[PDB]
Motif scaffolding. Structure first.
Motif, mmCIF file in Angstrom:
data_model
loop_
_atom_site.group_PDB
_atom_site.id
_atom_site.type_symbol
_atom_site.label_atom_id
_atom_site.label_comp_id
_atom_site.label_asym_id
_atom_site.label_seq_id
_atom_site.Cartn_x
_atom_site.Cartn_y
_atom_site.Cartn_z
ATOM 1 N N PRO A 175 -11.398 -35.361 12.238
ATOM 2 C CA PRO A 175 -11.980 -34.874 13.492
ATOM 3 C C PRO A 175 -13.404 -35.368 13.681
ATOM 4 O O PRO A 175 -14.077 -35.805 12.745
ATOM 5 C CB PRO A 175 -11.942 -33.349 13.343
ATOM 6 N N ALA A 176 -13.863 -35.284 14.927
ATOM 7 C CA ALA A 176 -15.188 -35.759 15.295
ATOM 8 C C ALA A 176 -16.285 -34.731 15.056
ATOM 9 O O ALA A 176 -17.467 -35.088 15.112
ATOM 10 C CB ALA A 176 -15.205 -36.175 16.771
ATOM 11 N N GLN A 177 -15.934 -33.474 14.790
ATOM 12 C CA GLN A 177 -16.939 -32.434 14.618
ATOM 13 C C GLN A 177 -16.340 -31.287 13.820
ATOM 14 O O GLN A 177 -15.208 -30.868 14.074
ATOM 15 C CB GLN A 177 -17.456 -31.934 15.972
ATOM 16 N N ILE A 178 -17.116 -30.791 12.855
ATOM 17 C CA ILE A 178 -16.647 -29.717 11.992
ATOM 18 C C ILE A 178 -16.401 -28.450 12.804
ATOM 19 O O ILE A 178 -17.034 -28.211 13.840
ATOM 20 C CB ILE A 178 -17.644 -29.449 10.850
ATOM 21 N N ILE A 179 -15.464 -27.635 12.327
ATOM 22 C CA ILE A 179 -15.146 -26.338 12.914
ATOM 23 C C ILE A 179 -15.727 -25.293 11.969
ATOM 24 O O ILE A 179 -15.123 -24.955 10.945
ATOM 25 C CB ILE A 179 -13.638 -26.158 13.132
ATOM 26 N N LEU A 180 -16.907 -24.790 12.309
ATOM 27 C CA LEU A 180 -17.651 -23.885 11.450
ATOM 28 C C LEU A 180 -17.274 -22.437 11.721
ATOM 29 O O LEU A 180 -16.956 -22.054 12.849
ATOM 30 C CB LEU A 180 -19.150 -24.071 11.661
ATOM 31 N N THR A 181 -17.314 -21.631 10.661
ATOM 32 C CA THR A 181 -17.020 -20.205 10.763
ATOM 33 C C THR A 181 -17.870 -19.479 9.725
ATOM 34 O O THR A 181 -17.501 -19.416 8.548
ATOM 35 C CB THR A 181 -15.535 -19.939 10.571
ATOM 36 N N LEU A 182 -18.999 -18.936 10.172
ATOM 37 C CA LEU A 182 -19.920 -18.216 9.306
ATOM 38 C C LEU A 182 -19.589 -16.733 9.317
ATOM 39 O O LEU A 182 -19.335 -16.152 10.376
ATOM 40 C CB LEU A 182 -21.363 -18.422 9.762
ATOM 41 N N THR A 183 -19.599 -16.124 8.132
ATOM 42 C CA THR A 183 -19.293 -14.704 7.990
ATOM 43 C C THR A 183 -20.237 -14.075 6.980
ATOM 44 O O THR A 183 -20.299 -14.509 5.826
ATOM 45 C CB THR A 183 -17.839 -14.484 7.554
ATOM 46 N N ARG A 184 -20.965 -13.052 7.424
ATOM 47 C CA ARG A 184 -21.648 -12.131 6.527
ATOM 48 C C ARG A 184 -20.619 -11.092 6.094
ATOM 49 O O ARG A 184 -19.418 -11.357 6.205
ATOM 50 C CB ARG A 184 -22.881 -11.502 7.185
ATOM 51 N N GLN A 185 -21.082 -9.939 5.588
ATOM 52 C CA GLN A 185 -20.278 -8.966 4.845
ATOM 53 C C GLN A 185 -18.858 -8.773 5.372
ATOM 54 O O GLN A 185 -17.882 -8.984 4.642
ATOM 55 C CB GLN A 185 -20.996 -7.612 4.851
ATOM 56 N N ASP A 186 -18.727 -8.372 6.635
ATOM 57 C CA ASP A 186 -17.424 -8.201 7.275
ATOM 58 C C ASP A 186 -17.321 -8.896 8.622
ATOM 59 O O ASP A 186 -16.254 -9.417 8.956
ATOM 60 C CB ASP A 186 -17.135 -6.711 7.454
ATOM 61 N N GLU A 187 -18.395 -8.914 9.399
ATOM 62 C CA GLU A 187 -18.384 -9.442 10.754
ATOM 63 C C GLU A 187 -18.939 -10.859 10.764
ATOM 64 O O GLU A 187 -19.862 -11.177 10.012
ATOM 65 C CB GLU A 187 -19.199 -8.545 11.695
ATOM 66 N N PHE A 188 -18.359 -11.712 11.602
ATOM 67 C CA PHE A 188 -18.840 -13.077 11.742
ATOM 68 C C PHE A 188 -19.944 -13.150 12.788
ATOM 69 O O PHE A 188 -19.983 -12.365 13.738
ATOM 70 C CB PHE A 188 -17.696 -14.031 12.110
ATOM 71 N N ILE A 189 -20.843 -14.116 12.600
ATOM 72 C CA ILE A 189 -21.834 -14.479 13.606
ATOM 73 C C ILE A 189 -21.343 -15.710 14.357
ATOM 74 O O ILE A 189 -21.685 -15.911 15.528
ATOM 75 C CB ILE A 189 -23.211 -14.732 12.967
ATOM 76 N N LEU A 190 -20.534 -16.534 13.692
ATOM 77 C CA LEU A 190 -19.993 -17.754 14.275
ATOM 78 C C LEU A 190 -18.534 -17.873 13.876
ATOM 79 O O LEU A 190 -18.210 -17.820 12.686
ATOM 80 C CB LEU A 190 -20.770 -18.986 13.801
#
Lengths: 160, 66, 52
Positions: free
Chosen positions: A28-43
């Motif tokens: 792919p041309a761009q990463i698919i990011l998924t940031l997660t703190r304790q339980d809830e994601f910011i991204l």
């Protein structure tokens, strides 16, 4: 008796993880990011151009289709760069980066706060607090000071 | 160092988080996230009829379980 | 030669998807590494089979 009236579902099934394939095509041309703190994601599955982590072995960088890897995150900052040239920095508290050959990032952390909500002034007092803790000879407070300085020094150099 | 002292990696992360929540500015973010670092829980084990604290593992992060 | 091949072996291990794109450069560096041994053997042949 009743034949096992209950049947609790395996909660893992509720999540939809990737199927990391060996790759029978392009990248792919761009990463698919998924940031997660304790339980809830910011991204959640945002398209992003690049990301730069801080680890124990050192400071790393990632692009689309980076080699499959998994590793710790040193307590410090994390830089992110979208396709639009802008940037986003997040102060973190440890974690585990999960990069894939398909091009996917799952960075599970404990805390994730923007730089905007942090003041160098409040960090300043905590510096000498950490130094006094480290210099105070005591196994209960020495390591606490070494760790407090371990988290302030990246911020100390990121702010300056 | 801190590893061989007896503390875990989880106590290490929680200590770092407890330190990070101090320095960040005051706002709704800190007003919420201090909940994610305050220690208020406890442990109990039931006697024959009475309640007693299973204090073999302290909740404070500076201590070492034994 | 093997150092040229070894990098391929790890690379495809670290990334099977890219094993197809890296092989031309393993062939390139292999042939252009073996060329110097080719010209050394050419020296071996020219030192004797033309001189007396």
């Amino acid at each position: 008796q009743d034949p096992r009236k209950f049947f609790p579902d395996n909660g893992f099934r509720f999540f939809d993880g990737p199927e990391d394939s060996f790759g029978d095509g392009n990248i792919p041309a761009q990463i698919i990011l998924t940031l997660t703190r304790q339980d809830e994601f910011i991204l959640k599955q945002e398209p992003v151009a690049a990301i730069t982590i801080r680890t124990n072995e050192g400071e790393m960088g990632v692009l689309a289709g980076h080699e499959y890897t998994v590793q710790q995150l040193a307590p410090g900052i994390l830089e992110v760069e979208y396709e639009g040239g802008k940037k986003d920095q997040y102060v973190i508290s440890g974690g585990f980066a999960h990069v894939n050959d398909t091009g996917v990032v799952d960075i599970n952390t404990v805390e994730a706060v923007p730089l905007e909500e942090i003041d160098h002034e409040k960090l300043a007092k905590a510096l000498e607090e950490a130094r006094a803790k480290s210099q105070s000879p005591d196994e209960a407070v020495r390591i606490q000071g070494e760790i407090a300085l371990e988290i302030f020094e990246p911020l100390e150099a990121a702010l300056h | 160092s801190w590893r061989d002292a007896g503390i875990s990696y989880l106590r290490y992360l929680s200590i770092v988080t407890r330190c990070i929540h101090e320095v960040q500015k005051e706002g709704p973010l800190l007003t919420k996230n201090v909940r994610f670092s305050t220690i208020g829980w406890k442990s109990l084990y039931l006697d024959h009829g009475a309640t007693k604290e299973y204090t073999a593992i302290p909740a404070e992060l500076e201590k070492i379980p034994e | 030669v093997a150092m040229c091949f070894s990098s391929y072996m790890l690379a495809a291990a670290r990334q099977p998807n890219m094993s197809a794109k890296l092989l031309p450069y393993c062939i390139l560096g292999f042939a252009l590494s073996e060329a110097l041994a080719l010209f050394t053997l050419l020296i071996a042949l020219l030192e004797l089979f033309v001189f007396s």
